[PDB]
Amino acid sequence: MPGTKRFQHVIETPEPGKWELSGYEAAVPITEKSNPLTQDLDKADAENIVRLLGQCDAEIFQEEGQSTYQRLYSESILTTMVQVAGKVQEVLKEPDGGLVVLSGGGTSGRMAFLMSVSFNQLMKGLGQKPLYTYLIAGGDRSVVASREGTEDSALHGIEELKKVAAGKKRVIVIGISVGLSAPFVAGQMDCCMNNTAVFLPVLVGFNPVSMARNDPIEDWSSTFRQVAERMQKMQEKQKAFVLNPAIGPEGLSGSSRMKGGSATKILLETLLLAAHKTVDQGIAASQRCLLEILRTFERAHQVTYSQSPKIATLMKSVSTSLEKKGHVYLVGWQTLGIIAIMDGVECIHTFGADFRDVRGFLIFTFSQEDFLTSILPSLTEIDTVVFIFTLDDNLTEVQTIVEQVKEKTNHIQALAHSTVGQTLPIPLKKLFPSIISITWPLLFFEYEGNFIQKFQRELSTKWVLNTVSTGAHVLLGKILQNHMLDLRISNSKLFWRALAMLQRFSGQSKARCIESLLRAIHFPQPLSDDIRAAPISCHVQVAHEKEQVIPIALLSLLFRCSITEAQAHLAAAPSVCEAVRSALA
Numbered sequence: 001m002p003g004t005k006r007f008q009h010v011i012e013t014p015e016p017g018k019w020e021l022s023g024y025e026a027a028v029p030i031t032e033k034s035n036p037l038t039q040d041l042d043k044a045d046a047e048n049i050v051r052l053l054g055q056c057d058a059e060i061f062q063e064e065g066q067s068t069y070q071r072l073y074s075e076s077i078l079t080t081m082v083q084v085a086g087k088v089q090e091v092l093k094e095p096d097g098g099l100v101v102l103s104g105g106g107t108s109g110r111m112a113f114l115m116s117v118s119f120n121q122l123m124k125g126l127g128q129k130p131l132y133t134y135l136i137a138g139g140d141r142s143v144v145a146s147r148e149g150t151e152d153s154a155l156h157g158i159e160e161l162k163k164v165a166a167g168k169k170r171v172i173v174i175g176i177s178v179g180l181s182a183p184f185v186a187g188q189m190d191c192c193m194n195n196t197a198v199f200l201p202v203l204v205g206f207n208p209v210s211m212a213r214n215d216p217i218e219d220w221s222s223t224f225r226q227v228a229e230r231m232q233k234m235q236e237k238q239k240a241f242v243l244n245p246a247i248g249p250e251g252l253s254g255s256s257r258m259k260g261g262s263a264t265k266i267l268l269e270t271l272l273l274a275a276h277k278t279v280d281q282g283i284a285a286s287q288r289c290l291l292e293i294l295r296t297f298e299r300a301h302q303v304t305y306s307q308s309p310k311i312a313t314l315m316k317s318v319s320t321s322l323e324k325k326g327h328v329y330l331v332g333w334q335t336l337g338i339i340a341i342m343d344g345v346e347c348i349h350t351f352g353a354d355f356r357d358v359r360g361f362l363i364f365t366f367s368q369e370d371f372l373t374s375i376l377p378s379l380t381e382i383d384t385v386v387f388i389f390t391l392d393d394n395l396t397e398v399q400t401i402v403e404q405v406k407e408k409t410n411h412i413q414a415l416a417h418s419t420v421g422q423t424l425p426i427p428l429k430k431l432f433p434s435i436i437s438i439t440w441p442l443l444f445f446e447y448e449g450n451f452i453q454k455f456q457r458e459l460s461t462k463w464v465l466n467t468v469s470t471g472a473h474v475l476l477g478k479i480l481q482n483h484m485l486d487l488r489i490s491n492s493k494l495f496w497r498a499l500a501m502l503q504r505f506s507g508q509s510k511a512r513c514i515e516s517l518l519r520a521i522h523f524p525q526p527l528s529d530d531i532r533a534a535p536i537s538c539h540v541q542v543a544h545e546k547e548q549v550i551p552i553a554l555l556s557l558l559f560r561c562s563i564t565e566a567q568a569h570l571a572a573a574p575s576v577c578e579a580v581r582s583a584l585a
């Protein structure tokens with residue numbers, strides 16, 4: 001029947017009460033799951049929100065229970081990290097015609113960029129040629145833009161890969177996809193397996209391979225799952241690798257920019273740093289050198305979240321400014337500036353928020369005076385401006401900008417990273433009365449830009465900004481339990497996530513949910529057979545431009561009414577949130 005090809009794979013909605021016993025819950029990929037810690041996140045206050053995400057983030061470092069999924073600390077995973085470190089060594093010994101690509105869509109792609117830079121720096125400070133590069137769904141521009149639609153083509157991924165891999169002789173391709181989902185990566189990994197003389201694919205993500213994505217990709221014949229299963233078979237002969245620890249669900253269901261991006265750095269920085277810092281010692285990478293690093297990353301979580309009360313406060317202020325109608329500026333230096341940009345941009349697609357709502361700034365790349373003359377003018381009594389820097393940064397450039405911002409603003413707060421016993425110039429740096437001083441112990445570092453200190457700091461900022469950005473929006477009522485219902489459908493994964501949210505919150509069949517969804521998307525056109533049979537990309541292209549697609553679709557269902565009737569209802573309610581929530585009641 002029309003549509004059967006496209007929707008056959010979708011699991012039926014269970015009868016009320018049998019969500020567990022239908023086996024439905026057990027087949028939800030971990031990366032899409034509702035985290036039980038966050039069932040009532042939409043009710044939590046700022047302090048709880050910080051607590052509940054701190055807990056969710058902790059799950060990264062939690063160990064394997066005694067019938068269950070491998071985790072970051074499990075022996076199978078650390079052994080895989082060692083073996084991969086090893087293959088990175090091979091290429092490090094033979095830099096001529098060698099290359100190491102880190103690749104991903106969206107936040108996986110963003111993380112890839114950071115790491116390729118860091119490790120390229122590292123080989124510079126040692127006077128070696130840079131061997132790292134990145135690849136992001138939609139080219140370089142995607143690093144710092146909301147561009148969710150660019151991940152759906154396997155040919156694109158392969159193309160980008162062919163460009164960069166030039167006339168190289170030995171290529172390591174680290175395909176990053178948190179959900180083991182992005183068609184962009186899938187095609188890269190498959191291409192690698194079809195030329196193993198040159199390519200070595202390493203897939204990174206955080207689902208078991210039995211939960212890897214399995215619906216058809218429009219421009220490619222195999223699924224992510226088939227690709228990953230075959231890489232796993234090659235791992236026996238050491239010609240492919242799959243590195244996939246479970247880290248437990250996101251605190252915002254399927255918001256893989258959070259734990260997933262974090263785990264990506266923890267996992268890949270750890271392994272690459274080990275491989276470098278152990279080549280020049282002429283010693284194999286071992287579980288012991290990896291562990292040192294992982295434990296440091298784990299202290300970093302503890303260090304970071306011990307500043308929780310302040311983190312809650314900055315959340316309450318970021319939220320306040322967005323409840324009124326102000327903006328939120330994230331101003332930071334080096335690498336920590338970028339991360340700030342990355343957070344701001346992600347808020348657009350993640351919460352449907354305008355790019356001014358939470359914006360990032362590096363010193364998007366607007367210099368000291370340029371910021372003072374351009375942006376400073378537009379500031380306002382209700383806004384919030386966050387400063388993010390180390391005490392190694394150039395604090396004369398910092399104080400200047402805060403001096404000025406204080407006048408036109410007042411809601412400032414800051415994120416200051418330091419070694420123990422560095423002191424904050426100006427004891428009347430108050431200015432910031434109640435800073436977020438994150439003060440780092442003294443580690444022993446032989447590489448020359450203290451790369452472990454950088455990684456700690458990046459990660460810690462990512463945790464803070466993410467928790468803030470996400471928390472501020474939850475407080476506003478935009479989140480339904482631990483799901484973002486009212487998302488914009490801009491790729492296929494999001495289209496499937498909409499359909500899952502329709503099933504979950506309505507309890508109605510998949511045929512009904514699909515029908516309501518496609519009607520909401522294509523309104524005012526009716527459901528023809530063509531539309532029913534259309535590739536998922538046709539729906540995406542149309543829904544991408546509309547507003548409230550998913551809430552309209554859900555209303556149609558709850559009221560058993562038409563799209564015309566549910567649009568009218570929505571427009572007659574005070575808000576999307578009250579409309580949906582009170583139809584649920």
Ligand SMILES: CC#C[C@H]1CN(S(=O)(=O)c2ccc(N)nc2)CCN1c1ccc(S(=O)(=O)NC)cc1
Pocket residue numbers: 010011028029031032033034179180181207211212213214215253254492493494496497499500501504
């Ligand atoms: C319909 C459907 C579905 C699946 C898979 N889709 S998928 O096909 O894009 C996908 C993504 C990643 C992956 N590893 N496998 C499939 C994502 C959303 N999915 C999903 C399924 C269930 C839920 S939920 O159970 O309502 N939240 C607990 C949330 C999301």
Ligand SMILES: O=P(O)(O)OC[C@@H](O)[C@@H](O)[C@H](O)[C@@H](O)CO
Pocket residue numbers: 104105106107108148151176177178179180181182254255256257258346349350
């Ligand atoms: O790394 P994945 O699972 O292939 O997901 C890649 C991207 O879709 C994902 O990072 C997304 O852009 C983020 O907005 C999710 O919060």
